[PDB]
Amino acid sequence: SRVCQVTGKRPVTGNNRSHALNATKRRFLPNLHSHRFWVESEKRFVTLRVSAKGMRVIDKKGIDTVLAELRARGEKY
Amino acid sequence: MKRTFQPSVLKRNRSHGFRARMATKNGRQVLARRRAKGRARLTVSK
Amino acid sequence: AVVKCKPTSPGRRHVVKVVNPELHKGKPFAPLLEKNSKSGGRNNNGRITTRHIGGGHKQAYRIVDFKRNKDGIPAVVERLEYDPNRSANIALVLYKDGERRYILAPKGLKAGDQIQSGVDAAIKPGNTLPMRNIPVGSTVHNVEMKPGKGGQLARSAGTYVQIVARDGAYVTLRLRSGEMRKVEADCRATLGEVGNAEHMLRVLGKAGAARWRGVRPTVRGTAMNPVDHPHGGGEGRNFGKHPVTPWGVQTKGKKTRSNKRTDKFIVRRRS
Amino acid sequence: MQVILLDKVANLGSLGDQVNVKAGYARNFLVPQGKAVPATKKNIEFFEARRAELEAKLAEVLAAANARAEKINALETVTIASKAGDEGKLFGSIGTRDIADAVTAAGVEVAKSEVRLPNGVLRTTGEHEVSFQVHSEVFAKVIVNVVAE
RNA sequence: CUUUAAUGUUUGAUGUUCUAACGUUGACCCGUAAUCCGGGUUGCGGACAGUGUCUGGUGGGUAGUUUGACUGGGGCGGUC
RNA sequence: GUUUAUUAAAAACACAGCACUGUGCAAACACGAAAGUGGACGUAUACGGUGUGACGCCUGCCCGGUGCCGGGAGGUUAAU
RNA sequence: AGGACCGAACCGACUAAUGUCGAAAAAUUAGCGGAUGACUUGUGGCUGGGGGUGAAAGGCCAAUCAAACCGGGAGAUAGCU
């Protein structure tokens, strides 16, 4: 699914309002992308479907720390 | 005058049989509803 | 050869037949055959995705070697055969090592002809060489998009491409549509023109001829009701609308190419 | 992004200077290749402690070894015999596979990625010049004379 | 201030080149008696394409609706 | 030849042929939130759409308006 | 050889009469068209409701179709009888 593997962002439904305030159901999608991150601890590349915000989160923290949290979450990466 | 109903045991079982209902969740709900109503015949049994 | 049959009955008056006396009168080579189940225009969802497809004669699939990777092995053309899956006839070729294969038959082939692949090959028609070794201005067919892909251009009967220029590692080809495309010099191509150039002279004659070829009748949009087609409706053949596809897209002169990825390889468009 | 640099970056390399860089540049090039390490209020103390000069010599010896290696073959000449065609049209284009293998067998033991070809893929038959880069600041020139067979 | 010019600053448009993001329905190897998929090597494109958020244009392809009353039946015309 | 099963079998629909138009192959297009599938294990002598409707003579003038294709002098013009 | 000819089985339904609380919720009798093909048929699959399929009639989709059937919102609303 369109779920970020780091921040957990998932599509959220909402409305779009016209000038006449007409409301139609829409859906907001996270800015997901497939990226390969190099991990020195295991010395290989890991592919994660992460959002742009998640990629910023990975940069701010360590890739090792994020992987540990993912492992604790219980979902394989 | 050919009529709408042309019996065929194989087609009847493979279409409305017990295993056909259990394949999908909608069929499982059909069985669940008919168990609740207490119907003697859950499905078309050969 | 083109033969006009006598009008002994309606349905034969306008039939023009193409007869090839050298075509093999017998069963094909079984080891290179495969079943070809028809689809009727339906996809995995079971819905009609392409219209006017269905029925027709059963036809098996011949594994035609487009890659032509047997480098350095001389081969001899055993015979020419009719391929129901293609407009062009195929040729069964036996290599010196005892292997048989199917290839598209250019105009010049005949039984017993010698063909060779690889860079160390002659210039006679039927030989496949990388386009770098092919002299500029020559006519080739079965050109490859990418090295090892197999060959996708000039595959129909009586088709070919022109090599016009060679800059650096890329080559410019003029396709039968009048479009100039830039291709890698490593791609292979087959010298000569695809055979059966008279395949376009047939007329099929009657309605049944197109019917057992796999084509179903086409219904005009005007003949339909408004709910079915953007055209249609009204009494007495009223149109009053711009021509459009059944799904609303404007046909009759609207460009639909939207790739932005292969445009770098296009030098000129159709005119 | 504020990062500390280890290797000599040709543009802004100064051995661990807090210099901003694009996130993509560090994420995709520097960090994976070991040319830098993300430092955010935690590794700055560590860099100035054990990375300050301890690895400076370790980094330098790699350049010294590279300089030694590229002078292993004083001849700096490569000769390969190929069955070229009649009056040009060499049999097939050759890049780095054959030349590197021949050099490795008899000459300088170098990796595949080291060899760079500035004059194409050696299409024409004759004398050609090949630029070898064993280091960012170390460039070597080798003359290759392919001879038709 | 009007009139001009060396080095350094913010720079943004354009152009060329590169590879390390990204794409690969190119080839080859392995998981594997596998035209799926994944990993590896290499080739070709390459910061383009593509995707997310915002925004202009187009949009009966689709949807929800409106389209007045008087009236010597109604409509037309006239009137309010 | 096909059609309103059950008041219309026809001049209606289809048809071979003809023309216009789109599509270079990860094709156009279609079904799918997507993956994917059909087109096609085909690739321009091919495929899709549209109109006309065997064959013979042919098919005139008009680009104002609305579409479609190309242009860029100048004006107006969103997010930011 | 033939979407060739005449004509049974088979498929279809142009005309007339009978039948309309019929033998039959479209039939019977006498004629009628195709009948080696774009034919017909058995068995089994696939396409699902704003969708399918349609040599295109708004035809067909279980005797029901300008939006099937069943249950639910639902005791919808009804300035009308």
Curated annotation (Swiss-Prot), chain A:
Q: How does it assemble?
A: Part of the 50S ribosomal subunit.
**One annotated GO biological process:** ribosomal large subunit assembly
Q: Which family does it belong to?
A: Belongs to the bacterial ribosomal protein bL28 family.
Q: Does the keyword RNA-binding apply?
A: yes
Matches recorded under InterPro entries: Ribosomal_bL28 (IPR026569), Ribosomal_bL28/bL31-like_sf (IPR034704), Ribosomal_bL28_bact-type (IPR001383), Ribosomal_bL28_sf (IPR037147)
Q: Which domain of life is it from?
A: Bacteria
Q: Which Pfam families match?
A: Ribosomal_L28
Gene3D superfamilies for this protein: Ribosomal protein L28/L24 (2.30.170.40)
Q: What is this protein called?
A: Large ribosomal subunit protein bL28
Q: Which HAMAP family match?
A: Ribosomal_bL28 (MF_00373)
UniProt keyword annotation of Transferase present: no
Q: What keywords are annotated for this sequence in UniProt?
A: Ribonucleoprotein, Ribosomal protein, RNA-binding, rRNA-binding
Taxonomic lineage is: Bacteria, Pseudomonadati, Pseudomonadota, Gammaproteobacteria, Enterobacterales
> Which molecular function GO terms apply here?
rRNA binding; structural constituent of ribosome
CC terms in the record's Gene Ontology section: cytoplasm; cytosol; cytosolic large ribosomal subunit
From Swiss-Prot, chain B:
Name of the protein in question? Large ribosomal subunit protein bL34
Which controlled-vocabulary keywords does the entry list? Ribonucleoprotein, Ribosomal protein
Q: Name one GO molecular function term.
A: structural constituent of ribosome
Assembly notes: Part of the 50S ribosomal subunit.
Picking any one GO biological process from the record gives: cytoplasmic translation
Write down the superkingdom of origin. Bacteria
GO CC annotation, single: cytosolic large ribosomal subunit
What family does the entry list? Belongs to the bacterial ribosomal protein bL34 family.
PANTHER family for the chain = LARGE RIBOSOMAL SUBUNIT PROTEIN BL34M, MITOCHONDRIAL RIBOSOMAL PROTEIN 34 FAMILY MEMBER
Question: Record's InterPro entries?
Answer: Ribosomal_bL34 (IPR000271), Ribosomal_bL34_CS (IPR020939)
Per the UniProt entry, what species is this protein from, by scientific name?
A: Escherichia coli (strain K12)
Pfam (any one): Ribosomal_L34
From Swiss-Prot, chain C:
Outline the segment boundaries, as ranges, of region: Disordered. 27-52, 220-271
Record keyword Kinase present = no
What's an example Gene Ontology biological process for this entry? ribosomal large subunit assembly
Write down a Pfam family by its short name: Ribosomal_L2
Question: InterPro entries recorded for this chain?
Answer: NA-bd_OB-fold, Rib_uL2_dom2, Ribosomal_uL2, Ribosomal_uL2_bac/org-type, Ribosomal_uL2_C, Ribosomal_uL2_CS, Ribosomal_uL2_dom3, Ribosomal_uL2_RNA-bd_dom
State the Gene Ontology terms under molecular function. Answer: RNA binding; rRNA binding; structural constituent of ribosome; transferase activity; zinc ion binding
Locate the compositionally biased regions of type Low complexity.
38-47
**Keywords for the protein's UniProt record, in alphabetical order:** Acetylation, Ribonucleoprotein, Ribosomal protein, RNA-binding, rRNA-binding
Could you give one GO CC term from the UniProt record?
cytosolic large ribosomal subunit
In this UniProt entry, the residues modified to N6-acetyllysine are: K241
- Per the record, the domain of life is Bacteria
Q: Does the keyword Ribonucleoprotein apply?
A: yes
Q: What does this protein do?
A: One of the primary rRNA binding proteins. Located near the base of the L1 stalk, it is probably also mobile. Required for association of the 30S and 50S subunits to form the 70S ribosome, for tRNA binding and peptide bond formation. It has been suggested to have peptidyltransferase activity; this is highly controversial. In the E.coli 70S ribosome in the initiation state it has been modeled to make several contacts with the 16S rRNA (forming bridge B7b, PubMed:12809609); these contacts are broken in the model with bound EF-G.
Q: How does it assemble?
A: Part of the 50S ribosomal subunit. Forms a bridge to the 30S subunit in the 70S ribosome, contacting the 16S rRNA. Interacts weakly with S6 in one of the 3.5 A resolved structures. In pull-down experiments interacts with CedA.
Q: What is this protein called?
A: Large ribosomal subunit protein uL2
Gene name on record? rplB
Curated annotation (Swiss-Prot), chain D:
Q: Which Pfam families match?
A: Ribosomal_L9_C, Ribosomal_L9_N
Could you tell me the keywords of this UniProt record? Answer: Acetylation, Ribonucleoprotein, Ribosomal protein, RNA-binding, rRNA-binding
The domain of life is Bacteria
Provide GO CC annotations from the record: cytoplasm; cytosol; cytosolic large ribosomal subunit
N6-acetyllysine carried by residues: K89
Q: Which HAMAP family match?
A: Ribosomal_bL9 (MF_00503)
The family assignment reads:
Belongs to the bacterial ribosomal protein bL9 family.
Q: What does this protein do?
A: One of the primary rRNA binding proteins, it binds very close to the 3' end of the 23S rRNA.
The name under which this protein is listed is Large ribosomal subunit protein bL9
Organism of origin is Escherichia coli (strain K12)
The gene name on file is: rplI
